[PDB]
Design a protein around this ligand. Structure first.
Ligand SMILES: C=CCc1cccc(C)c1O
Ligand SMILES: [Cl-]
Ligand SMILES: [Cl-]
Length: 162
């Protein structure tokens, strides 16, 4: 298992513009296009991102391409965050995947306000952190997924992803 397989499991793959769980225009492997509720803004965005007029549809290769960039962007976001960097580096590899997933799903922003959890993760207080983590809108809106990630933090193994 690795970060890509992991996130490809959590986000799925779709070749046509779609609305995510928050009702936003997305495509491929969880690639957010825009927050605006205008489809046309979305297609514009899609066009800009691929480098061609897609008319709302892309190839697998194209999705995978966006995906590579996106993973990359997430990690790099982590490492550039003073609050995040230190935690992330304190962790082992599996656990690090869990951190990327959260960041991929919610942004460096969303993750930065998980102060308390962050701290607990840094201290290696696994179960403690796992409980804290659950007390959140994130867990409550996307429970199956949050569950997987949390377990991942808690145990350091890939069991949640079987
Ligand atoms: C709940 C936060 C866990 C966490 C620790 C380190 C770095 C990132 C990006 C992260 O999401
Ligand atoms: Cl792009
Ligand atoms: Cl879910």
């Amino acid at each position: 298992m690795n970060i890509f397989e992991m996130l490809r499991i959590d986000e799925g793959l779709r070749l046509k513009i779609y609305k995510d769980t928050e009702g936003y225009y997305t495509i491929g492997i969880g690639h957010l296009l825009t927050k605006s509720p205008s489809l046309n803004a979305a297609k514009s965005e899609l066009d800009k991102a691929i480098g061609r007029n897609c008319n709302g549809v892309i190839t697998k290769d194209e999705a995978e391409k966006l995906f590579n960039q996106d993973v990359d962007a997430a990690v790099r976001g982590i490492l550039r965050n003073a609050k995040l960097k230190p935690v992330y580096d304190s962790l082992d590899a599996v656990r690090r995947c869990a951190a990327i997933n959260q960041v991929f799903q919610m942004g460096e922003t969303g993750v930065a306000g998980f102060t308390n959890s962050l701290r607990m993760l840094q201290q290696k207080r696994w179960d403690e952190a796992a409980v804290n983590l659950a007390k959140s809108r994130w867990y409550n809106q996307t429970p199956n997924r949050a569950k997987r990630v949390i377990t991942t933090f808690r145990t350091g193994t890939w069991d949640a992803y079987k």
